[PDB]
Amino acid sequence: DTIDLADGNYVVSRGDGWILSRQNQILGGSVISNGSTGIVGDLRVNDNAIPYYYPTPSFNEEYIKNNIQTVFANFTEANQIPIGFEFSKTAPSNKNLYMYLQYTYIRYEIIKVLQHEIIERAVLYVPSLGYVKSIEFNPGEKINKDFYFLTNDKCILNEQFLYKKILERVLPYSNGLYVINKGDGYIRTNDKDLIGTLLIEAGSSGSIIQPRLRNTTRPLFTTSNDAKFSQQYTEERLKDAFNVQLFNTSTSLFKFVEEAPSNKNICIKAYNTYEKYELIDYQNGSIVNKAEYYLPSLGYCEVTNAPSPESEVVKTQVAEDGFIQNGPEEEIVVGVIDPSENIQEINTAISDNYTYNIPNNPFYILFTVNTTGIYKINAQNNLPSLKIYEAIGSGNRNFQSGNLCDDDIKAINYITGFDSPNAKSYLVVLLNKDKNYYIRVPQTSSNIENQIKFKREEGDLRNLMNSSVNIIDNLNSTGAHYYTRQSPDVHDYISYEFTIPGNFNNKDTSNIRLYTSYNQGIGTLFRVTETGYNLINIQQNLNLLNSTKSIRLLNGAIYILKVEVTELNNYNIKLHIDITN
Amino acid sequence: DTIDLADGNYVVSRGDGWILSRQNQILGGSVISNGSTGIVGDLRVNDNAIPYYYPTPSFNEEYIKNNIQTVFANFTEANQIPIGFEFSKTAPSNKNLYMYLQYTYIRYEIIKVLQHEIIERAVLYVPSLGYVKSIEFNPGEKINKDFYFLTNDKCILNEQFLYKKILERVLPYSNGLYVINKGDGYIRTNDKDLIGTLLIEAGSSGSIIQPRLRNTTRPLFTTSNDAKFSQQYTEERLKDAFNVQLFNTSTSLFKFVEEAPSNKNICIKAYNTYEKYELIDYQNGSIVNKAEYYLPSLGYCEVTNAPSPESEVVKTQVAEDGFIQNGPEEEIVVGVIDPSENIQEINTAISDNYTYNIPNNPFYILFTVNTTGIYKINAQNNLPSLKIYEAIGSGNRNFQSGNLCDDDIKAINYITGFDSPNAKSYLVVLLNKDKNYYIRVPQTSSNIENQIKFKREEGDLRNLMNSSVNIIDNLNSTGAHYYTRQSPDVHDYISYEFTIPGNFNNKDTSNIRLYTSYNQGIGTLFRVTETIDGYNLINIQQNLNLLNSTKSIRLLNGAIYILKVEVTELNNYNIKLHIDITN
Amino acid sequence: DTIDLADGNYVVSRGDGWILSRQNQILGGSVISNGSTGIVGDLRVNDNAIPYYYPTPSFNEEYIKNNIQTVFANFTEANQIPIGFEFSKTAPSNKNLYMYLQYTYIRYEIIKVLQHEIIERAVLYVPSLGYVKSIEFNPGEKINKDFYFLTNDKCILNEQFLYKKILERVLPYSNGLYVINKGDGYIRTNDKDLIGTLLIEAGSSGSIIQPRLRNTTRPLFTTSNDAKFSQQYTEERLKDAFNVQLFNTSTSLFKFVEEAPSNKNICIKAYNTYEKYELIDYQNGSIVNKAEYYLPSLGYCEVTNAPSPESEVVKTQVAEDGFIQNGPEEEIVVGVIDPSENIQEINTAISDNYTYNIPGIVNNNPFYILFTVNTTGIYKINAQNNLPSLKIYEAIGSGNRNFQSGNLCDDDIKAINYITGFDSPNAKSYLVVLLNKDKNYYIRVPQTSSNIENQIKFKREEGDLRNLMNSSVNIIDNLNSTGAHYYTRQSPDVHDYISYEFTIPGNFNNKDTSNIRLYTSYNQGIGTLFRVTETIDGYNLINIQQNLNLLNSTKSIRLLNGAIYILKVEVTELNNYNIKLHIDITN
Numbered sequence A: 001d002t003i004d005l006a007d008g009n010y011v012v013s014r015g016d017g018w019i020l021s022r023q024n025q026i027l028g029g030s031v032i033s034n035g036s037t038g039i040v041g042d043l044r045v046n047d048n049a050i051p052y053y054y055p056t057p058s059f060n061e062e063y064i065k066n067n068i069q070t071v072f073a074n075f076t077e078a079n080q081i082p083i084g085f086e087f088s089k090t091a092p093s094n095k096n097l098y099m100y101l102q103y104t105y106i107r108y109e110i111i112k113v114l115q116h117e118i119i120e121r122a123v124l125y126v127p128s129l130g131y132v133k134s135i136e137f138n139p140g141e142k143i144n145k146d147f148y149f150l151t152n153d154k155c156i157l158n159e160q161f162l163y164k165k166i167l168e169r170v171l172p173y174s175n176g177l178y179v180i181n182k183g184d185g186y187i188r189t190n191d192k193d194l195i196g197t198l199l200i201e202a203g204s205s206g207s208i209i210q211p212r213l214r215n216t217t218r219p220l221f222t223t224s225n226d227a228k229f230s231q232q233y234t235e236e237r238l239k240d241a242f243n244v245q246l247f248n249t250s251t252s253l254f255k256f257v258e259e260a261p262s263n264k265n266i267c268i269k270a271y272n273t274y275e276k277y278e279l280i281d282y283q284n285g286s287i288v289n290k291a292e293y294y295l296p297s298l299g300y301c302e303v304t305n306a307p308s309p310e311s312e313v314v315k316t317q318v319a320e321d322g323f324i325q326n327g328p329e330e331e332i333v334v335g336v337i338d339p340s341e342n343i344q345e346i347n348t349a350i351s352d353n354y355t356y357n358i359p360n361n362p363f364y365i366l367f368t369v370n371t372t373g374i375y376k377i378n379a380q381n382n383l384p385s386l387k388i389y390e391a392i393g394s395g396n397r398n399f400q401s402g403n404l405c406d407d408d409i410k411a412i413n414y415i416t417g418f419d420s421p422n423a424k425s426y427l428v429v430l431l432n433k434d435k436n437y438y439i440r441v442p443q444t445s446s447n448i449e450n451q452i453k454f455k456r457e458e459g460d461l462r463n464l465m466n467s468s469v470n471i472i473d474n475l476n477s478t479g480a481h482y483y484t485r486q487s488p489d490v491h492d493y494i495s496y497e498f499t500i501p502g503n504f505n506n507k508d509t510s511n512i513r514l515y516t517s518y519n520q521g522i523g524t525l526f527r528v529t530e531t532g533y534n535l536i537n538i539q540q541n542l543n544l545l546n547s548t549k550s551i552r553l554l555n556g557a558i559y560i561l562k563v564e565v566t567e568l569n570n571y572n573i574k575l576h577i578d579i580t581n
Numbered sequence B: 001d002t003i004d005l006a007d008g009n010y011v012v013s014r015g016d017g018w019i020l021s022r023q024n025q026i027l028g029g030s031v032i033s034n035g036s037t038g039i040v041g042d043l044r045v046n047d048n049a050i051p052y053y054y055p056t057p058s059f060n061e062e063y064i065k066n067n068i069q070t071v072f073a074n075f076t077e078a079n080q081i082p083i084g085f086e087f088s089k090t091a092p093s094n095k096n097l098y099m100y101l102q103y104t105y106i107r108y109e110i111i112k113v114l115q116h117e118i119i120e121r122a123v124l125y126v127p128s129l130g131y132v133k134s135i136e137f138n139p140g141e142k143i144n145k146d147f148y149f150l151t152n153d154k155c156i157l158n159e160q161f162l163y164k165k166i167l168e169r170v171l172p173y174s175n176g177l178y179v180i181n182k183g184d185g186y187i188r189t190n191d192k193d194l195i196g197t198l199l200i201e202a203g204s205s206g207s208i209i210q211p212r213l214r215n216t217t218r219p220l221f222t223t224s225n226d227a228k229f230s231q232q233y234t235e236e237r238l239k240d241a242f243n244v245q246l247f248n249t250s251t252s253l254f255k256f257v258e259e260a261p262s263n264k265n266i267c268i269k270a271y272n273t274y275e276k277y278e279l280i281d282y283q284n285g286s287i288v289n290k291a292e293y294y295l296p297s298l299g300y301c302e303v304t305n306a307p308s309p310e311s312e313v314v315k316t317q318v319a320e321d322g323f324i325q326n327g328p329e330e331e332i333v334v335g336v337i338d339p340s341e342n343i344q345e346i347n348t349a350i351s352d353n354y355t356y357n358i359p360n361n362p363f364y365i366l367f368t369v370n371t372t373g374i375y376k377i378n379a380q381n382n383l384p385s386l387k388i389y390e391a392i393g394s395g396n397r398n399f400q401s402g403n404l405c406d407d408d409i410k411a412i413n414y415i416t417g418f419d420s421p422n423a424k425s426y427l428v429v430l431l432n433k434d435k436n437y438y439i440r441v442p443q444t445s446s447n448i449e450n451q452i453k454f455k456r457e458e459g460d461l462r463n464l465m466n467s468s469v470n471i472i473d474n475l476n477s478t479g480a481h482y483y484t485r486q487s488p489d490v491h492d493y494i495s496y497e498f499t500i501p502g503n504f505n506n507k508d509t510s511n512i513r514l515y516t517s518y519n520q521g522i523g524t525l526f527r528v529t530e531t532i533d534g535y536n537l538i539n540i541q542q543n544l545n546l547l548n549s550t551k552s553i554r555l556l557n558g559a560i561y562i563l564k565v566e567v568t569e570l571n572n573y574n575i576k577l578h579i580d581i582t583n
Numbered sequence C: 001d002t003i004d005l006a007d008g009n010y011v012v013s014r015g016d017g018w019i020l021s022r023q024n025q026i027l028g029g030s031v032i033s034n035g036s037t038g039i040v041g042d043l044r045v046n047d048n049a050i051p052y053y054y055p056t057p058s059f060n061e062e063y064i065k066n067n068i069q070t071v072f073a074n075f076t077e078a079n080q081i082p083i084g085f086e087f088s089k090t091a092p093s094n095k096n097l098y099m100y101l102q103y104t105y106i107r108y109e110i111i112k113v114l115q116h117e118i119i120e121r122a123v124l125y126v127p128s129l130g131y132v133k134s135i136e137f138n139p140g141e142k143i144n145k146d147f148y149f150l151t152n153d154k155c156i157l158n159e160q161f162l163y164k165k166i167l168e169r170v171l172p173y174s175n176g177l178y179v180i181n182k183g184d185g186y187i188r189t190n191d192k193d194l195i196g197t198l199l200i201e202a203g204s205s206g207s208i209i210q211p212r213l214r215n216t217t218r219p220l221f222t223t224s225n226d227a228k229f230s231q232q233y234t235e236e237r238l239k240d241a242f243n244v245q246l247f248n249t250s251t252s253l254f255k256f257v258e259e260a261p262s263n264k265n266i267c268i269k270a271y272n273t274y275e276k277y278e279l280i281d282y283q284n285g286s287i288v289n290k291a292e293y294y295l296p297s298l299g300y301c302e303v304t305n306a307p308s309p310e311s312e313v314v315k316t317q318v319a320e321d322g323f324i325q326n327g328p329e330e331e332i333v334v335g336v337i338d339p340s341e342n343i344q345e346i347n348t349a350i351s352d353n354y355t356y357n358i359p360g361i362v363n364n365n366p367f368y369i370l371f372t373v374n375t376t377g378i379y380k381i382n383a384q385n386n387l388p389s390l391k392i393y394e395a396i397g398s399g400n401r402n403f404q405s406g407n408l409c410d411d412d413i414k415a416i417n418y419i420t421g422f423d424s425p426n427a428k429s430y431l432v433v434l435l436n437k438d439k440n441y442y443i444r445v446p447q448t449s450s451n452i453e454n455q456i457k458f459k460r461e462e463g464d465l466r467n468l469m470n471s472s473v474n475i476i477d478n479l480n481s482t483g484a485h486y487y488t489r490q491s492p493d494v495h496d497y498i499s500y501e502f503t504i505p506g507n508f509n510n511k512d513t514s515n516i517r518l519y520t521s522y523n524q525g526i527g528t529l530f531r532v533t534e535t536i537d538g539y540n541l542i543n544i545q546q547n548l549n550l551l552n553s554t555k556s557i558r559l560l561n562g563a564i565y566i567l568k569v570e571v572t573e574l575n576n577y578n579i580k581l582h583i584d585i586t587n
């Protein structure tokens, strides 16, 4: 026939809901009477789900299968999983109803177009779901032959003609591993995840069913790097983040049931779905490795008013390969222990003071504290810089007074600390007694003993709460200095402890310009009196971006500036300490 | 007791719905509360489908079993296939309900009658489905013992007493095969296909379930001739006709659900059903072989207001073996390719002209045409007579411009042609471009070369469409002539081409009386005037009504005429045209 | 925290309905739209029925498991049997709904308390059922993280705190065996038979399902003596009584469906249940042997308003082990043939007379005689000289099936309704009983230390003896003089009869009398007194006193010396297992 398409070969979906010549009653039917309900159903499986190919000299079976499976639903992978369906009809209160069952199919075609004419067409019918036809009858009644017997193939829904030409944001995340739940109800384009379509006539019911007769599910997986982020590695990380236990099996049942009102015909399309997880290796403000894992989920059901079988068919082009999300928007970001980095434990709940010895690759220390309190945590001479995380949902399970219970959690929430191994720093942090925490100690280039010290702070240092504290040690006589670190998020703090150059006579003073380069924030500056440490507040509410303001500070005296980020413009925060006469 | 039955031994069904003394609560029950619905059910199979025999000296267990199974439902056969049932009850807001399950049974009996007295009685209870009784209750409430505990066997339905004394049409079809769908919802007499009955209490619901826990179905099959129509051959024929694929298995579930109103108890009975196919080998007006295939189908359920468990029991004799149809009237006739006959193909679509060389036995030629048109199809000198069929549902699938696509259809509607050795004919038929067709060439007795000629007709010959034209030769100058052929069906056509005797001079005539003997029909008469691209037809008389017609008409000597007959009344398998000449 | 408990180790149930940190969405969810219904559920078995242990030095996995399973539901045994659950939600017109599935757990704890402080806690999450949360959303719209993601474990129901400290009526029945159905819907205390709990969101539906993927059930049995009443013996008694066949399997399906109103969330608790059977050996007024047999049944569904999860947790001691009946009140008492006693049969239906000869040895064992009669009527039945005393029972449900004119049909029924007769080694009596032609009866002859030849006589009675229908008649034969006399027998039940045939002392001359005081001691009854006259036409009971109120009656009557009277007693107040009749004779 005639067609407005450039010359070439096209794969075509003509839609679901096709029934086949002559094959109407081959499954039998039911006779119900007098207000009773009949429910007839079936299960599309291996042996009753036979595709029927109608090839042509240019388009053989193989060519057809390949071109259809490339663009449309892969019916070979789909056909080992039993999918059920059922229809319900109620008989009138003084009449008999005859209902019979027929398999439906999707019609695919391969067409050759020369000069706006289709000069060859191959057809493939792919098993889909089913259709019930019923009629009310009395003894005697002559019923039209066509109720029982179809002379020519046809669609019980509206036909389609969907074709394809055949050819030939600052993320201030700490460095580490993240698993992100990006939400549910993902399907692929072009009906690749279509289970099937039922036509549910007025005052009847219809169901599409996943009964888990087999448990097999089919996850979808891609990776920027199969050496680091293999499928198995990605599954282990999903396990660490969300305790996903089953990847390619499920016992979880789903089905969709639709009762069509009086005087309305309904179309129910049912789809397989996935829940989309991202596994990212995040370093220095960028994605270094990324894997996508589409976990098999529990379906999507589209209900439309059933259009005419007869309305005109609009030739439409297929979408690009890809995914459509039909579930709600969602982004859950969960850090995970890097399994290449070993976990050491402190079994004693920390009291007031504790010292952990370190005989080397990065590793974690798991620990808890006896009483909620602010803690200073540092290595010896403040090297290396540490990070600390919360084990997520820890501390709600097993407990023992004065000791650690490892409740086995590798989902971690970053609190504070830099990925600057060789920067001097100490952490100051509020630690809740009913949680477990991880210290991360980075890669050291050393032979020496090192120690992590934990000290409950009950003094002024408390006012540096939830802060890493950088120790500046290279303040020259005058001139400009900058210190670049990973920026904390908005409302999160970073702190700098520095000695003004020169000898202390309590009289000699230098001018100090404290400003940031990219990010806005609030500074609180404090004189250190060295009791622990006493902090005298000497400048509040400083506003740091590009600030020109100047303050005079005592030579050889020690100060700490606390910075609350307020504007996150850049992954990095760069503090300047410029000193003059 | 007294009974009005002649002396002898009888098997009796006293019906379904029997419940057994003391065994009320041995399956347990459910307690539901405060708006919740409880659903209790079971599955009748193997171990819980063990009958209870109660023999007497004259009637042992083998004798009870055999006599019961010969006349009523075979309970051994049916035990294999799990049948399910369930009952649903909703507790009212803020009350508690108790619902308990009991199996029901069919009670069979063997009785010996003498001088109108039952002197001996054996009993068999065959497990059927089950029954749930419910009661609302308050804490500490006294319940009647009879609610919980039955002291004597009884029927919860009306009893039956169905007994048996123990001893000691013109088919105008072309020769070939036909499968016929005679409809759905068939059952055997005497409750042989009864699945079961539920009593459903007011304000509750009940279901009978075929869950396909095993897939086995049981077709019923008869044949006149297992040599030719075996079961397997009959099944392949069904496959050819309707693409039937599964004969003794099914994944198709069926279930019946009934909700009793507030004000009455309901009875639901459910039956296994069959769809009935007839396969016939039809030759020269008679059925020569015939098999019946009863394909397992998806059930029948009958819903009655529950009769009173104390209404009058009327003694009734068992019906003859047979089938009742509870589905709607249906007759679908599908011709099928005879598998013993080979298929050849013309691979190029026919346009204006084609000559097919015949490579003997009957065979088919599968072919298509390029553009819907009228075709004249004949063999050399019109011998032998050919037939032509439509492949049903062909042409809607694969297509290639100018060529045949075989969509492998063996289901055929006859269009026209004769089974008639020695009778010269040619076909004139409307062929649609989006169908394939089968020519059938019959058994030929000669070893000379023959060709099938195909010709697109653009002119008058189009007036003969959907008919075969019998060539009649050598009418004599005076008196009676007649020709018997297979009758077309009502509204189909047969044609005759005949030459008036005598020399053509465009003037001399003879008086021609045209009539049929048995069947009624309408005759259109054409005079043939011949050109070198084929015949011109002059319609000289329409609506001649042919049965024993006395009308005559003067026709030109030496001239060729064609009579096209539309059959209007099919009284005889054959039609007989008379040509009686006077003047 | 601080805790008002005494020192020691405790097992604690913190309730069903716990959901776990982070795992909320790992089974997937469903998106439904427009009018459609989504039904999401699962099946709790082996791989997804694995517990999560969080142990401590003092409380290891095995200690936790064992101490929990002792007091609370045994999840290891219940782990084999698939229990199904499903939730159903209907998306409104022109809207989309997302609904996701999460497993629920019972949270159990072992705690060490010292000085009103919990100093150690181990935790066990046992897989229970599941929970489906749903939300309305628009395509492209965000939902808050807390809908999707739980940071800390919590209970979606109200929590509980149920702890246990860990430590390292006259029965007027004839002598014989009885199986008693005490009713249905029994569960054990402390949620030992809890199948699971569903929180059902407003406007949705939830269902708990026993689909019998496995057929196994688990009866509960306890006996006072395993030598007499073993489990096998008790089951065989249940078979005799109610024809119970399957004790530890079932193909019987049950499921509960609960639809929550538009307005409130609902909580459904499903339980396995049992039917309580008592097997007793009853002798001279006392239960001498007893078994209890809890036969697995078809469950119990309790529907309650979903209590707030933020509800005040009140620390409560567990109940003692035992049972709670949720089904309706029921007591069905079925006598059973004692299998230690032999059954003889009279194969011919009895007509108007029959004699059945009984042999004697030094020590005759008790035995039964199964028989039937040809004509409905009243029968007199006794041994020779009315010794020993006999009992008669009806075979329950007999006579409804196989039949052969004139013969007994043994329809094999060991379930028996006591009609009348005494267990009294020393009492002479005969029986007077309405027998139905369409029924089998059993006579029980007791153990007799006699070795004499005896016979059981059966006689159809059409005269006055019918006034005594359904009683035993005690032959008193020691009224040898003036003086106090009493006679202790098993009391009939209320509205049943006991009779007494007695001869006044002295020579008969139709004139002489002595004074007779008739009364009972413990039970009230109504007496009818007849003179027995034996004339040419035959025998007659002459009614001489009616509606005599016997309990401590001070009425006295003059009765003829050497004449025979019969006192029929209808028991009206069953105060005592025995009825004590006095016959005090003065001049």
Ligand SMILES: CC(=O)N[C@H]1[C@H]([C@H](O)[C@H](O)CO)O[C@@](O)(C(=O)O)C[C@@H]1O
Pocket (backbone or CB within 6 Å): C426, C427, C428, C478, C484, C485, C486, C487, C488, C489
């Ligand atoms: C001897 C007498 O007058 N009465 C006695 C009776 C009878 O001898 C028997 O019961 C007859 O069967 O026996 C008793 O045990 C009793 O029944 O309480 C004690 C009572 O003193």
